[PDB]
Swiss-Prot record:
Name of the featured protein: Mitogen-activated protein kinase 14
Effect caused by changing residue 330 to S: Emulation of the active state. Increase in activity
SUPFAM superfamilies (alphabetical): Protein kinase-like (PK-like) (SSF56112)
Gene: MAPK14
GO molecular function: ATP binding; enzyme binding; MAP kinase activity; MAP kinase kinase activity; mitogen-activated protein kinase p38 binding; NFAT protein binding; protein phosphatase binding; protein serine kinase activity
Subunit structure: Component of a signaling complex containing at least AKAP13, PKN1, MAPK14, ZAK and MAP2K3. Within this complex, AKAP13 interacts directly with PKN1, which in turn recruits MAPK14, MAP2K3 and ZAK. Binds to a kinase interaction motif within the protein tyrosine phosphatase, PTPRR. This interaction retains MAPK14 in the cytoplasm and prevents nuclear accumulation. Interacts with SPAG9 and GADD45A. Interacts with CDC25B, CDC25C, DUSP1, DUSP10, DUSP16, NP60, SUPT20H and TAB1. Interacts with casein kinase II subunits CSNK2A1 and CSNK2B. Interacts with PPM1D.
Regulation affecting activity: Activated by cell stresses such as DNA damage, heat shock, osmotic shock, anisomycin and sodium arsenite, as well as pro-inflammatory stimuli such as bacterial lipopolysaccharide (LPS) and interleukin-1. Activation occurs through dual phosphorylation of Thr-183 and Tyr-185 by either of two dual specificity kinases, MAP2K3/MKK3 or MAP2K6/MKK6, and potentially also MAP2K4/MKK4, as well as by TAB1-mediated autophosphorylation.
Organism: Homo sapiens (Human)
Lineage top rank: taxon: Eukaryota
Length: 355
């Protein structure tokens, strides 16, 4: 009645685009799909679930302490998430039969074709389509935030949408966003809260609410809310909308130079959001206000947003689950490469697939 043995499937070996792919035979007809510095990816047919899946062979997962710790951190997150608005892990394997021969990590996920950009390129979304997506984003973030994970890079390129307008969040909780350049007229930095983009204070899950506020506004108007040609420009665009900070917010900011800078800016009142988003549903404008609050301590939570009147057609407290606890002790801990490799191997071998 209890399992003793992990029975090991049969793997087959092949070369596609000068990339060795050794995988279980359950994965057939692999198609090269692309190669970034985050792994090579193949489309594949999973004969056990009937789904079509993305197989991802990590690239150089253990080449430095930083990168070893990134491989583990990502694998830990993917394993933990079990919510239909969050990319789950459906399988993770390696050809290695022991930690000594262990080198490669493959990650199996739902093949998720289109992202929120591609969706907006092809249609003008109806009002109900927009509402439904903000709901799902907030629903998956409620989950994420329940387990004390901060997405840290929530933006349209990190949301996958299917034909029935069903949404999953991608790429949450990782250190990789620091590898993109955030200088100039760049989309990555356009969705970030001012406090992390100028490192006024340290991260906070409220940082992600700022992001969904920026996406919602883009989904209602079709325009980027804050397309700043640089940090300072983006900050000015922000303060114009939400108003210069007050005393309670300025003392929360640790750098003495940054408060001198803010108080050098000409003080401005907050703008009237009804005159900024002409034509929008008043309930949508009301909720935007509560997401776009300069002081993160006063931003709305995802759990509060779901209960806001804008979502009355979709809100149901009995279908908005929270996650199990996510132990992140390991983030403060100082290990060697080989030790991070061993903990990654241990989670690879201990993976339990979904029922």
């Amino acid at each position: 009645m209890l399992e003793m043995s992990q029975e090991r499937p049969t793997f087959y070996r092949q070369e596609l685009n000068k990339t060795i792919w050794e995988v279980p035979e359950r994965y057939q007809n692999l198609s090269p799909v692309g190669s970034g510095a985050y792994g090579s990816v193949c489309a594949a047919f999973d004969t056990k679930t009937g789904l079509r899946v993305a197989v991802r062979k990590l690239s150089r997962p253990f080449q430095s302490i930083i990168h070893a710790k990134r491989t583990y951190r990502e694998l830990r997150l993917l394993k933990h998430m079990k919510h239909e608005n969050v990319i789950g892990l459906l399988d993770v394997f390696t050809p290695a039969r022991s930690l000594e021969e262990f080198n490669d990590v493959y990650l199996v996920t739902h093949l998720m074709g289109a992202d929120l950009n591609n969706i907006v390129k092809c249609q003008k979304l109806t009002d109900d389509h927009v509402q439904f997506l903000i709901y799902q984003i907030l629903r998956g973030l409620k989950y994420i935030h329940s387990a004390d994970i901060i997405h840290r890079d929530l933006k349209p390129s990190n949301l996958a949408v299917n034909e029935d307008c069903e949404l999953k969040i991608l790429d949450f909780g990782l250190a990789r966003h620091t590898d993109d350049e955030m200088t100039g007229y760049v989309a990555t930095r356009w969705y970030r809260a001012p406090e992390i983009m100028l490192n006024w204070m340290h991260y906070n899950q409220t940082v992600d609410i700022w992001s969904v506020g920026c996406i919602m506004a883009e989904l209602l108007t079709g325009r980027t809310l804050f397309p700043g040609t640089d940090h300072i420009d983006q900050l000015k665009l922000i303060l114009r909308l939400v108003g210069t900070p007050g005393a309670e917010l300025l003392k929360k900011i640790s750098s003495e130079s940054a408060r001198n800078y803010i108080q050098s800016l000409t003080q401005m009142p907050k703008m009237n959001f009804a005159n900024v988003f002409i034509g929008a549903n008043p309930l949508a404008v009301d909720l935007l206000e509560k997401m776009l609050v300069l002081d993160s301590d006063k931003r709305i939570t995802a759990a509060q947003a779901l209960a806001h009147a804008y979502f009355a057609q979709y809100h149901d407290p009995d279908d908005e689950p929270v996650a199990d606890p996510y132990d992140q002790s390991f983030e403060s801990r100082d290990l060697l490469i080989d030790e991070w490799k061993s903990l990654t191997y241990d989670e690879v071998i201990s993976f339990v697939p979904p029922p």
